[PDB]
Ligand SMILES: NC(=O)c1ccc[n+]([C@@H]2O[C@H](COP(=O)([O-])OP(=O)(O)OC[C@H]3O[C@@H](n4cnc5c(N)ncnc54)[C@H](O)[C@@H]3O)[C@@H](O)[C@H]2O)c1
Ligand SMILES: Nc1nc2c(ncn2[C@@H]2O[C@H](COP(=O)(O)OP(=O)(O)OP(=O)(O)O)[C@@H](O)[C@H]2O)c(=O)[nH]1
Ligand SMILES: Nc1nc2c(ncn2[C@@H]2O[C@H](COP(=O)(O)OP(=O)(O)OP(=O)(O)O)[C@@H](O)[C@H]2O)c(=O)[nH]1
Ligand SMILES: Nc1ncnc2c1ncn2[C@@H]1O[C@H](COP(=O)(O)OP(=O)(O)OP(=O)(O)O)[C@@H](O)[C@H]1O
Ligand SMILES: O=c1[nH]cnc2c1ncn2[C@@H]1O[C@H](COP(=O)(O)O)[C@@H](O)[C@H]1O
């Protein structure tokens with residue numbers, strides 16, 4: 001038996017202090033697989049599944065046609 | 080002091096007490112001093128005790144085996160192979176407690192019945 | 202805009218203080234429906250759905266055959282206690298299953314050479330009086346006639362051939378016809394019995410007017426695909442329980458519950474594995490668990506249901522004989538919030554004293570509620586009156602009590618249903634499933650009830666009084 | 673994975689509210705042994721080990737010679 005350490009997400013966010021990404025960490029676990037085996041298939045909407053989570057934001061300094069092509073080729077999607 | 084039942088004996092053994100010393104639980108028995116009908120040692124300059132009476136409970140040689148079996152079953156229901164393992168479990172944090180408010184205390188011999196008898200095998 | 206009041210279930214139970222049913226309340230909501238509209242269809246195990254959540258606990262002072270019948274008729278289910286000979290338990294389950302039948306596939310029959318005394322003897326022995334008659338005195342023979350009570354309203358030495366209604370007169374339906382058409386020809390016939398014979402004129406099975414009359418009378422009964430009452434039985438975890446279970450399944454049990462003070466043990470898990478190997482079609486309900494850790498390994502073993510609660514029974518002295526236990530409200534909440542992910546329903550047993558406790562238990566995630574003392578003194582309960590925990594006697598786990606008698610189940614349970622319906626209607630839940638979804642999403646909110654708020658039930662402002670529930 | 677339930681002894685007694693035996697419970701665990709297998713050997717003092725924890729209190733209404741004998745015979749000790 002080994003005691004549990006750290007806060008669940010629910011416990012962490014219950015305090016209502018306004019956390020951001022730079023304000024908490026995830027404690028490690030157990031490794032029994034090569035890194036490349038991880039699968040990133042993610043769902044964009046309820047009928048589109050992307051093989052990677054990456055998306056490019058719709059802005060006039062990013063996501064041209066030539067970037068939407070080059071980001072759809074790599075598994076993501078561009079707006 | 081305070082030991083009234085096997086539950087209290089095991090609770091005291093769980094909290095770190097190596098042994099448990101009994102008073103009233105053994106006061107009325109075939110081996111206890113005096114005689115029957117049908118006392119705190121400071122009970123009499125000031126009264127530290129009281130003079131009581133108890134229902135008689137047979138003999139120690141027939142009553143203590145029940146008190147041992149109750150302890151064994153109480154630890155077996157917890158998963159401790161011995162008292163030392165039970166106290167080690169309490170110390171390491173493996174054995175966990177729950178608080179018992181009054182409305183959870185009344186859930187022992189609940190008063191749903193009109194009358195009853197106990198008959199412990201003793 | 203109106204501010205939110207009260208604590209969600211999660212907020213109420215996060216403090217970890219050990220709440221019970223008498224230690225909190227549910228704040229009301231909005232009413233836009235008549236009480237009778239509420240729907241109580243509850244799930245016993247993963248393949249049994251009961252039209253009411255009431256269960257009778259397996260004990261030697263409750264759940265006879267005559268109470269399992271009278272509680273299955275009213276929509277619930279009853280578990281036959283296992284403090285009896287295995288043949289006795291099998292007989293109890295047989296009598297539970299042979300109350301209403303549909304196709305009576307094993308009717309007792311006689312040959313024409315028998316005697317009116319024999320027919321009367323069989324009547325006194327079982328209860329059925331419409332004895333079919335076949336040439337060989339068995340199912341595999343020509344149907345020659347039938348003898349019923351109306352034929353014997355009287356001499357006892359006369360043979361059945363002199364009292365039978367012959368086959369030339371009988372109105373019979375050809376075998377292989379669906380149940381509906383069989384009932385149609387029975388009802389146009391205006392006669393009590395409709396034997397069923399095949400194209401070879403050989404008796405196959407019979408149906409009775411009284412079975413469909415019982416269906417008409419009891420709309421909420423619980424039945425299987427053969428239209429015969431649903432029965433459950435309890436069994437221990439010793440070795441002899443294997444032969445016990447063999448006998449039980451011979452009787453025709455539908456659901457079996459493992460009986461143990463603490464469920465989480467290698468012996469219970471071995472029984473679960475044996476059951477799910479020998480009888481894959483039988484639903485097994487796990488033992489008494491009060492924690493997620495206890496529930497997990499029973500779920501893995503493959504219990505189709507879970508019994509939650511330990512130490513809180515009315516007749517239970519476990520909390521005093523040993524130090525283990527957990528308050529009923531916290532126990533039911535915290536094993537029913539975990540079980541829900543795997544679909545195994547929960548049966549919160551013990552501590553139920555009132556309709557308020559029944560509804561409180563069903564609000565906290567318990568799919569069904571199992572009752573003890575509430576049903577112990579009734580016309581259908583075992584024993585006799587004047588004017589007992591199953592471990593009450595090496596050590597006393599129970600107590601022998603007495604209760605004030607409460608009439609019959611068939612007149613007591615409708616009030617118990619109406620109370621639940623009104624309690625949910627006052628909250629605004631169209632059904633128990635909606636109530637538990639409300640509890641889970643956070644819409645249904647609770648309030649704590651200190652002692653000075655508990656004393657505000659039947660307050661002691663009165664000198665004396667009477668209750669008179671319509672029952 | 674299954675979440676932990678209940679309070680450790682340290683957590684239970686940290687509040688400093690004055691608990692007694694009738695004020696808390698012990699949650700159950702796992703059973704893989706017959707009850708009789710449990711061993712109760714307990715230590716009275718640093719050089720006396722009793723095969724059972726039971727002791728009889730020293731009082732004038734208990735622990736005669738005839739009870740000290742009958743309690744030492746059963747594994748305990750009497751004062
Ligand atoms: N409210 C409660 O939680 C509660 C508490 C105590 C008793 N009860 C009731 O009392 C009745 C019996 O309780 P019980 O605890 O005596 O049940 P039980 O005797 O069937 O099981 C308890 C004991 O049986 C032993 N056991 C089980 N299978 C075994 C096997 N194969 N080999 C060896 N030992 C084995 C266990 O180790 C344990 O000591 C039941 O009706 C039960 O529900 C209920
Ligand atoms: N002979 C016989 N027929 C039955 C029995 N129970 C139901 N039936 C028939 O099976 C059909 C059941 O459909 P309904 O009567 O519409 O519905 P119900 O009463 O809810 O039926 P259950 O779901 O069995 O309660 C009808 O034809 C009934 O007459 C029974 O015990 N015996
Ligand atoms: N009212 C009434 N019911 C009858 C009569 N004869 C038989 N029955 C009922 O027919 C019903 C049919 O259901 P079952 O009990 O399953 O019938 P069975 O399986 O043939 O026989 P038993 O188990 O012996 O009762 C029985 O419950 C009997 O009570 C009779 O003369 N009058
Ligand atoms: N299929 C059938 N066709 C014709 N007559 C039948 C048939 N089955 C039974 N009978 C006869 O009809 C008469 C009454 O049958 P029924 O089944 O209504 O009696 P019962 O229900 O046993 O009597 P009770 O009036 O006590 O309820 C008897 O003479 C019986 O033998
Ligand atoms: O006279 C007395 N006054 C106060 N405490 C006493 C007296 N005599 C014995 N005790 C203590 O009280 C205990 C008995 O309590 P019991 O276990 O509940 O019966 C023992 O722990 C004693 O040492």
Ligand SMILES: O=c1[nH]cnc2c1ncn2[C@@H]1O[C@H](COP(=O)(O)O)[C@@H](O)[C@H]1O
Nearest residue numbers: 514515550551573574590591592598599
């Ligand atoms: O003999 C016993 N000792 C301890 N608990 C029992 C015993 N018999 C039945 N029980 C349980 O106690 C309950 C009955 O409590 P009630 O609902 O308050 O009457 C059911 O949940 C049972 O399974």
